[PDB]
Design a binder for this molecule. Structure first.
Ligand code: MG
Ligand code: MG
Lengths: 453, 124, 230, 350, 225, 260
RNA sequence: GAAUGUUACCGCAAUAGUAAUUGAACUUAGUACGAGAGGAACAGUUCAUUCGGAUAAUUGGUUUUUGCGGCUGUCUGAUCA
RNA sequence: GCAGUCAAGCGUUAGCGACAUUGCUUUUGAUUCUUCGAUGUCGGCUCUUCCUAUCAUACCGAAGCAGAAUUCGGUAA
RNA sequence: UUCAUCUAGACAGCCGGACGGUGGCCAUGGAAGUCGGAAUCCGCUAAGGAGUGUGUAACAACUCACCGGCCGAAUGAACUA
């Protein structure tokens, strides 16, 4: 899988794992066997115990193998990141050694099970089982160092970032201590240390922010020193790999000030030598700490170096600062516009002659005041009544008696709905005398018609 | 009163149309010695498509029962039942595959499955 | 996700007030808890606890001795350095395995009254020329599961064990009819393909086979061990 | 796996008496007035009530629901005596008993067996001791005041007033919830021969428990794997708890059956009458659920031995209509008026 | 006006409620959080009648109506009808339409000026609905969908339909209804847009699953701002 | 052990004689067993025999034997009890093998192959009479048996062999005598696969009126003709599919495959 | 069934056995935690499988009401009952 | 296991020997397609009873345990 | 039982010193003693480890190895029954 494989079961060291397996085998299997028991039963019991131990070991090893991220072919960016973090060759060799140990355990268990079914004396079966257990322990014993290294890398791999390069992304990069970490903290709702040293954000922290109704993620990295492409550290190698593999332009930062005490010529030369990384990214350049420099008041010789930056096609020089973040809005807007342009370039009513209507928003809603939840001076919001009443557990909703009718006495009157005959609703109508005035005449004309005498 | 037992060949109730379905399994069944699962009205069950669309055949999908056909004592004292057993098919979240339904649906199943209620016009 | 920040959060909230005090109190109580557990942890647990305590004590003693020694203060070629390293048999008077159940009897026929069958319950090596005869002739049966072709071999020189094919068996004491049967019967002398070591006798005639005696009991173990008779 | 019942209910021999003896009584709250802990009566039959409930958070909230309910006959009762008990290491022991000497023929018949052949030599002889200026019952009261920290009152059912005509009444003990036993004994003495009202001891929505004897079924005595190498069903005392009282039945007047909603003026008497029972004409209690035993079997009502604060007990009923159709077959009408309306005039009418 | 709102744990807002330009129906079950959530946007302009239909909590789909009146299925009990009559405004009328179909909200969808009905609905019921709502009636289906109300949502402003509707069908529906029509989606592509949410000329309510683009589309089509 | 009869006979048999279906010998040519024999039993000849030649065209069998002859004798054989074909050649081969092992004075031959291919029938026709029970059923024997002939060689009987493999492909497995079709609940799903191997004209020749499409329709028509159709036109596909699979296993419908 | 001079009522208990079980809809929650993905339980209500104690008004089978009306054939000479 | 290695201690006091320790113990998550003569009556239904070397529920504990969720020591029949 | 501490103040308890070249040499964005590793010096004394730990980007911040200010009479370590 991808995206934070932390779900690995954080296997215990070799000694602890072996102790756990042995305890499980002892607990989950019978123990009291006697010489007087039939040879077949004793052999079956010993074979069952050996098979249970072997199956437990095999299941543990298989789960360990499966839980790993399957570095091979997973992704070039992820593969390079894992290689830098954990020295891919060693990790692959450790996994191969674990697989070989599992195969050896399987073979040993099978061989001992095949041999175990022929021992006659109970002592012979006991010795065979002990030899099988010793062989399994010896096989597991040599696995201590690979298991410990895998546990360490898992402890580190679980907390690694989780981003898809194929998605739309914009990154921030530049010299360390340029305020890049502060820019990342301000631009997106992410918390990162802003301490003033050249390795503040050692790890590649991931930031997320939304613009134009779309999510735009970002990453952080301290950048690159002189680094003539022969002597590079793991942290800088990770940044180089990320810049190479990642999607649309990463923002290049430059501290045009006394801080970051490398001559601006060195900063220009860094990006000039890194130019091959700008094959199709349409790189953008943002000057940091502009508040205390005002690049407009810059030496002509230094301005020439900045001018040389503009010479390379598809670049821009935007002003930004950390003390005041007003420029961050424009920076993010321009970055998002460029990202959308790059992602895009890769590719009624009919007035039916009769209908008349007006927007029928009721005058009440038109003139009613806007509601404010945080303001104490607001409507009751009888949800509050329920909360103070004890929530829905005991709040007896009583919207009844609070409805519009002719009189306030009808609110509490209990409608009978039954009068010893079929419900009045079938004939419940105002002015019931319409069905009573003629009843007297009907009775009179039925009595005086000779039908009863 | 529980509905059809395990393996009952119930008819489909969706608009896509299917000959029938086989209830290989039940969810939330009352697992008990000698007491087989019995899917009741409104209960989501995993029933294989015994016959129907060529692609739907030979695969199990969550089937939602919409008719019971058996006498069950609702909290209302009336012992109502239906013509025959029928049930729609939907994903585990109740997303019915079809865009409509065939036949009426009961209130008990509609209440538990808002999507099914929205997907039915003749309710109760 | 979110790499080691947890350290950052600890640094921004700083070791919750009771955490340090509770940790110190637990550490102080560790000795008392260990002493109490020395009486608890009954059968099947006290033994393990005592073994662990003994191992820890031995390690502590060996570390203290190393520190004390430190506080006081076979030539090899330049290419081998920095690299990993009266004719009685070694085991005379071997255990007298008797003619007994080891010749296990297997009941034959539907009515078990004419078994006449004997099965050898000891490891035996035959090789390619086994060619099981018709079932009617199986007077003696050596099970396949109990057949081994490669036996462990070692010598008191460099301590290197290498699995090598078994060549043949020459002399099994105690009724060498077992020798004729090819049974291992620890205490036997067997030939082993020593071509791997490549030792060369005088005259340039490289040797590739020597007779070795089985040291371990293959009957009670799933592996065969032997020592080169050099 | 489970077994054929509960081992705690076995052995299951026949009960020693038809009347279910009370195993325990509610704790005596001294702060409360002198009330009655329990009641006794005979259950008439079953009926169905349709009503709505105020149960917020429930699926059927505000919706009408029909629940099984039963009617228990409980005519007026008169106290016949008082009993005191003293705590001892052997347990509570009866100290002394007192009688009013104004005992109806029902208790005399209960005491005897062949009343018709009996000479009717009732308590008269002992009563002659009480038939004086007193100082005897005063002595008994003093003895029960100095001792007998727990007092149980004795009452007898008005079997003659029961719709099912009978001459022999039941007798049982009932405890009091009043203050110090002084008030208990004073109230008991003042209430000698006084009628007892059922409504005074219970109220609507009150949670109560009951004990009774289940229907007998006669002798009820295959796998040959029961024992290792190394016979009656029914007619036993059973207890049930958490029963909600829906309404107190003032059956000595009309309108009890009809609720404020339906107001279909009529009594709870089912059309034709209860199966194997008479025609209720006195006070009764309406309780939901069911109680062990059958019609005419004596039952006891108790208030669960403890107070409950669960919302289920707090919830109040809103009875809209009570079913009273003829239980003698597939009844279709509640009163003869409905049957006449449906069928109109008949041969018997003219 | 367009504020995210959720049922207990269901995004089908319109199943348990049916908002209208002059009243709103909400199921009596659950808690007052839904009631207060609707009150916040609706204030106290019109009564919010807590009521059930045939004992079910799907009153939003069972019943349907407009500003001039409200219609309920025959399955509705007498008590529910009386409560609706005594709670709804005097202008709104209610009747026990005696027709085979029950789910008015699913089988029928309408606004203050136009109403769509099932092609097989009885003439008497159609005439009663037309008289009650003061709106025209037309026999139509949305891309063959028998349940017009389960997919189609229509108010005085523009309308919304499930995405499966074809371009020609969308244009025909817009022309017949004389309202703007966009084949948007709600609740993360849910096809129950006609019944899983409620909306009117001033207020739009939908489940939290509605993504920001969906909310923007709803606002643009209904022009709440 | 029912299955381990493979190991039992391999260890007991001096020479293993492979039996394969003439329609597709590669199906019965599993390599896993041959690899073990090569690694551990160099003293076994591992001879091959092509059974069921009469069920395929003569040229197809000739091409198959020519292709397989690069590493095996590939003796053509037919499993008729009395009218056997190639019996003389196999008898001569066994006589030559015995002549090679004259110093042994004893020898036995074991049979390896899928169930119901030619094992029991070939043994019986070698004996010239029915000795081992034979029927159109995969399971004809549950335990091994020994048969004498010429007083110098022995025959070893065993059940069919199908080595486990993750590539089992139950769909492909059902197209051979390995599977007892009688116990399959839904044989219908596998009917369409027959058209991939069997010729269209051959079906019409050995199956009633043809011109079918959507092979389920062919099953419907066959059931209608045979009278096994249920009321309303619905066919009893279970019985029809069972009969079709049984006929395919028995070779009633002719079909064959050819090598590159 | 002898208990305890006789009978019947009320009760206490020395003693034997003991039972309930598990899950979920909400509230608190789309909040704490979460850059994102995802996301609780501490309180109160409300439901659910199995099992234990009871039935008997509602519902299925079991029918010796011989109960109702009728159908095939026989009989008191077809039909009376 | 065999043959050593260090050697807490006992040693005829040259030998033993607790715990550790080296060699058997396809380094690229490949696939072994392997599952090798158990000569014996047992096998499976229901219900009960007993143990804990306990799977869930219950109890609390140690974890790169931030939550969800996961690894494990222990109490508990 | 043996070996040392001793009124040239017995063990344990409260306070300070714990230096100067130095931030050793190679590894190098940081190893100022506590991520790598060779020796672990000389100056200096009552005493100081190119460091025992706790913790830091980097020292920094705190403890003892070892000593002294008060105490105030036997104490610490390994074995045997
Ligand atoms: Mg910084
Ligand atoms: Mg066969």
């Amino acid at each position: 899988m991808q995206l934070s494989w932390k779900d690995i079961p954080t296997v215990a060291p070799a000694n602890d794992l072996l102790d756990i397996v042995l305890n499980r085998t002892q607990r989950k299997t019978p123990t009291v066997i006697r010489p007087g028991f039939k040879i077949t039963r004793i052999r079956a019991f010993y074979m069952r115990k050996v098979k249970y131990t072997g199956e437990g070991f095999v299941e543990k090893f298989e789960d360990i193998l499966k839980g790993f991220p399957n570095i091979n072919d997973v992704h070039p960016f992820h593969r390079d990141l894992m290689d830098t973090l954990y020295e891919k060759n060693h990790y692959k060799i450790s996994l191969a050694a674990i697989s070989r140990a599992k195969s050896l355990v399987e073979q040993v268990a099978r061989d001992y099970v095949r041999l175990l079914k022929f021992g006659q004396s109970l002592f012979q079966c006991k010795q065979l089982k002990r030899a099988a257990l010793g062989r399994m322990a010896t096989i597991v014993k040599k696995l201590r160092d690979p298991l410990a290294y895998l546990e360490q890398v898992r402890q580190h791999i679980g907390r690694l970032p989780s981003i898809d390069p194929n998605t739309r992304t914009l990154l921030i990069c530049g010299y360390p201590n340029v305020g890049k970490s502060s820019f990342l903290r301000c631009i997106t709702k992410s918390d990162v240390d802003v301490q003033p040293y050249a390795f503040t954000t050692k790890s590649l922290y991931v930031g997320h922010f939304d613009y134009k109704y779309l999510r735009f993620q970002a990453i952080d990295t301290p950048g690159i020193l002189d680094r003539p492409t022969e002597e590079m550290n793991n942290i800088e190698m990770q940044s180089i790999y990320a810049i190479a593999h990642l999607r649309s332009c990463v923002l290049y930062f430059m501290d045009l000030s006394e801080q970051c005490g490398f001559t601006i010529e060195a900063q220009v030369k860094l990006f000039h030598s890194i130019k091959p990384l700008f094959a199709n990214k349409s790189v953008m350049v943002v000057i940091n700490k502009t508040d205390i420099i005002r690049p407009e008041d810059l030496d002509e010789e230094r301005a020439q170096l900045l001018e040389s930056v503009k010479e390379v096609p598809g670049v821009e020089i935007m002003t930004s600062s950390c003390q005041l973040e007003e420029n961050v809005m424009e920076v993010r807007n321009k970055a998002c516009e460029k990202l959308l342009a790059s992602r895009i370039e890769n590719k009624q009513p009919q007035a039916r002659d009769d209908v008349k209507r007006t927007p029928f928003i009721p005058e009440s809603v038109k003139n009613l005041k806007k509601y404010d939840p945080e303001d104490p001076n607001r409507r009751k919001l009888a949800r509050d009544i329920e909360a103070e009443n004890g929530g829905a557990g005991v709040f007896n909703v009583n919207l009844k008696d609070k409805y519009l009718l002719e009189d306030d006495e009808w609110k509490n009157d209990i409608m009978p709905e039954i009068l010893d005959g079929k419900n009045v609703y079938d004939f419940l109508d105002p002015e019931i005398a319409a069905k009573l005035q003629a009843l007297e005449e009907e009775e009179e004309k039925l009595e005086n018609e000779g039908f009863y005498n | 009163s529980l509905g059809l037992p395990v393996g009952a060949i119930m008819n489909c109730a969706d608009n896509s149309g299917a000959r029938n379905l086989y209830i290989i399994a039940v969810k939330g069944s009352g697992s008990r010695l000698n007491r087989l699962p019995a899917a009741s009205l409104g209960d989501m069950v995993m029933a294989t498509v015994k016959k129907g669309k060529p692609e739907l055949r030979k695969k199990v999908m969550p089937a939602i029962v919409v008719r019971q056909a058996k006498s069950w004592r609702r909290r209302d004292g009336v012992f109502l039942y239906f013509e025959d057993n029928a049930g729609v098919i939907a994903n585990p979240k109740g997303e019915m595959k079809g865009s409509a339904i065939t036949g009426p649906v009961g209130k008990e199943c509609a209440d538990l499955w808002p999507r099914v209620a929205s997907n039915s016009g003749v309710v109760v | 996700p979110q790499n080691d920040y947890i350290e950052r959060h600890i640094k921004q909230h700083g070791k919750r007030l009771d955490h340090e005090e509770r940790k110190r109190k637990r550490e102080a109580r560790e000795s008392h808890k260990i002493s109490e557990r020395a009486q608890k942890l009954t059968g099947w647990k006290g033994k393990q606890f005592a073994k662990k305590r003994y191992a820890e004590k031995v390690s502590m003693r060996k570390k203290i001795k190393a520190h004390e020694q430190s506080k006081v203060k076979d030539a090899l070629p330049t290419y081998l350095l920095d690299r990993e390293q009266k004719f009685s048999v070694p085991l005379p008077k071997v255990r007298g395995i008797s003619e007994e159940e080891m010749f296990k009897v297997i009941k034959t026929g539907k009515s078990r009254s004419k078994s006449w069958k004997r099965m050898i319950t000891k490891h035996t090596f035959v090789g390619e020329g086994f060619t099981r005869r018709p079932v009617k002739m199986e007077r003696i049966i050596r099970p396949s599961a109990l057949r081994q072709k490669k036996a462990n071999v070692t010598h008191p020189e460099l301590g290197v064990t290498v699995f090598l094919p078994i060549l043949a068996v020459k002399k099994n004491p105690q009724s060498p009819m077992y020798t004729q049967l090819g049974v291992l019967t620890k205490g036997t002398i067997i030939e082993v393909n020593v071509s791997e070591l490549g030792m060369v006798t005088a005259g340039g005639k490289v040797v590739w086979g020597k007779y070795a005696q089985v040291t371990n009991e293959p009957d009670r173990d799933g592996c065969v061990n032997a020592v080169l008779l050099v | 796996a489970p077994r054929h019942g509960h081992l705690g209910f076995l052995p299951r021999k026949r009960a020693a008496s038809i009347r279910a003896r009370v195993k325990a009584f509610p704790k005596d709250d001294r702060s409360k007035p002198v009330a009655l802990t329990s009641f006794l009566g005979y259950k008439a039959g079953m009926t169905t009530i349709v009503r709505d409930l105020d149960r917020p958070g429930s699926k059927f909230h505000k919706r009408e629901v029909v629940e099984a309910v039963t009617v228990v006959d409980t005519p007026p009762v008169v106290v016949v005596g008082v009993v005191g008990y003293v705590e001892t290491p052997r347990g509570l022991r009866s100290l002394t008993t007192v009688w009013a000497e104004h005992l109806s023929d029902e208790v005399k018949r209960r005491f005897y067996k062949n009343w018709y052949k009996s000479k009717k030599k009732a308590f008269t002889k002992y009563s002659a001791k009480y038939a004086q200026d007193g100082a005897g019952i005063e002595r008994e009261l003093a003895r029960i005041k100095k001792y007998a920290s727990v007092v149980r009152v004795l009452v007898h059912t008005q079997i003659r007033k029961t719709p099912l005509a009978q001459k022999k009444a039941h007798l049982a003990e009932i405890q009091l919830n009043g203050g110090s036993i002084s008030e208990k004994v004073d109230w008991a003495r003042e209430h000698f021969e006084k009628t007892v009202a059922v409504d005074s001891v219970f109220e609507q929505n009150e949670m109560i428990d009951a004990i009774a004897v289940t229907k007998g079924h006669g002798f009820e005595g295959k796998v040959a794997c029961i024992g290792a190498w190394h016979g009656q069903r029914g007619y036993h005392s059973r207890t049930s708890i958490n029963h909600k009282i829906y309404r107190v039945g003032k059956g000595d007047d009309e309108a009890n059956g009809a609720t404020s909603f339906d107001r279909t003026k009529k009594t709870i008497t089912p059309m034709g009458g209860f199966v194997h029972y008479g025609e209720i004409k006195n006070d009764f209690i309406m309780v939901k659920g069911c109680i062990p035993g059958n019609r005419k079997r004596i039952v006891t009502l108790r208030k669960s031995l403890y107070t409950n604060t669960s919302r289920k007990a707090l919830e109040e009923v809103s009875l809209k209509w009570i079913d009273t159709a003829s239980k003698f077959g597939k009844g279709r009408f509640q009163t003869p008026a409905e049957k006449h309306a449906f069928m109109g005039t008949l041969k018997k009418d003219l | 006006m367009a504020t995210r709102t959720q049922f207990e744990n269901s995004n089908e807002i319109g199943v348990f409620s049916k908002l209208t330009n002059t009243y709103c129906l909400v199921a009596v079950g659950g808690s007052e959080n839904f009631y207060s959530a609707f009150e916040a946007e609706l204030g106290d302009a019109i009564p919010i009648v807590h009521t059930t239909i045939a004992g079910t909590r799907i009153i939003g789909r069972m019943t349907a109506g407009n500003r001039r009146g409200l219609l309920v299925p025959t399955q509705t009990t007498d008590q529910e009808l009386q409560h609706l009559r005594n709670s709804l405004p005097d202008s709104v009328k209610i009747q026990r339409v005696e027709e085979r179909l029950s789910a008015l909200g699913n089988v029928i969808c309408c606004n203050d000026y136009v109403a769509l009905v099932h092609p097989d609905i009885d003439r008497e019921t159609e005439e009663l609905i037309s008289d009650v709502l003061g709106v025209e009636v037309f026999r139509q289906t949305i891309s063959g969908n028998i349940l017009v109300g389960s997919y189609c949502s229509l108010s005085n402003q523009g309308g919304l339909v499930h995405p499966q509707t074809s371009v020609q069908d969308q244009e025909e529906l817009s022309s017949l209804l004389q309202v703007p029509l966009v084949a948007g989606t709600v609740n993360r592509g849910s096809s129950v847009v006609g019944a899983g949410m409620v909306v009117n000329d001033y207020l739009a309510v939908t489940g939290l699953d509605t993504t920001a683009p969906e909310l923007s589309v709803i606002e643009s089509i209904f022009r709440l701002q | 052990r029912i299955w381990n009869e493979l190991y039992k006979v391999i260890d007991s048999s001096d020479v293993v004689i492979h039996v394969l279906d003439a329609r597709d010998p590669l199906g019965t040519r599993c390599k896993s067993v041959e690899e073990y024999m090569k690694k551990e039993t160099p003293h076994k000849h591992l001879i091959y025999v092509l059974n069921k030649c009469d069920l395929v065209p003569t040229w197809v069998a000739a091409a198959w034997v020519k292709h397989l002859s690069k590493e095996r004798p590939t003796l053509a054989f037919h499993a008729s009890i009395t009218n056997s074909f190639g019996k003389g050649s196999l008898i001569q081969l066994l006589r030559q093998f015995s002549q090679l092992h004259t110093d042994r004075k004893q020898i036995s031959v074991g049979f390896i192959g899928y169930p119901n291919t030619g094992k029991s029938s070939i043994i019986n026709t070698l004996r010239k009479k029915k000795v081992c029970q034979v029927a159109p059923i995969p399971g004809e024997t549950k335990v091994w048996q020994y048969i004498t002939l010429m007083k110098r060689i022995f025959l070893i009987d065993c059940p069919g062999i199908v080595p486990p493999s993750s590539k089992d492909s139950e769909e492909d497995i059902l197209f051979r005598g390995v599977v007892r079709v009688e116990h399959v609940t839904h044989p219908e799903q596998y009917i369409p696969g027959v058209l991939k191997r069997c010729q269209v004209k051959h079906l019409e020749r050995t199956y009633e009126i043809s011109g079918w499409k959507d092979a389920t329709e062919f099953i419907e028509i066959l059931a209608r003709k045979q009278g096994r159709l249920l009321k309303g036109g619905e066919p009893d596909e279970s019985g029809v599919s069972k009969q079709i699979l049984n006929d395919f296993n028995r070779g009633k419908i002719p079909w064959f495959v050819l090598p590159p």
